[PDB]
Design a protein around this ligand. Sequence first.
Ligand SMILES: [Ca+2]
Ligand SMILES: [Ca+2]
Ligand SMILES: [Ca+2]
Ligand SMILES: [Ca+2]
Length: 138
Amino acid sequence: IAEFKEAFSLFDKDGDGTITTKELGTVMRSLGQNPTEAELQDMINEVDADGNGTIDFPEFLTMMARKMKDTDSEEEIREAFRVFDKDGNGYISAAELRHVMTNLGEKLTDEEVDEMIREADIDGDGQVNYEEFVQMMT
Ligand SMILES: [Ca+2]
Ligand SMILES: [Ca+2]
Ligand SMILES: [Ca+2]
Ligand SMILES: [Ca+2]
């Protein structure tokens, strides 16, 4: 929380308790991004729960708690995908899947693992990439 309040303190350049689009802009610029006023206003609006035009700590903390929880769940889905992607090439092959499933207690045939890939293989390249992996978890 204090880590999140500490982050808040860097955005609030003048310490009045709120983050304006200009203050957000100043930070983003120090991060190697130079968004247009248009973009900056979208970013504020996305977080500005009471609509008053600026972001306060409770608004900031609330978005960060979701972003943390979203980030935690992606890190963990990413962990699972690597486990399946044995050679690490970013695609899960029929053979890696079959092999990892046997490790998961499920001795499957080439036909069964082939159907499992096809059900997941949106782009049709005979394998499962990370995007397709997340969809069939979903
Ligand atoms: Ca301020
Ligand atoms: Ca607000
Ligand atoms: Ca692979
Ligand atoms: Ca595919």
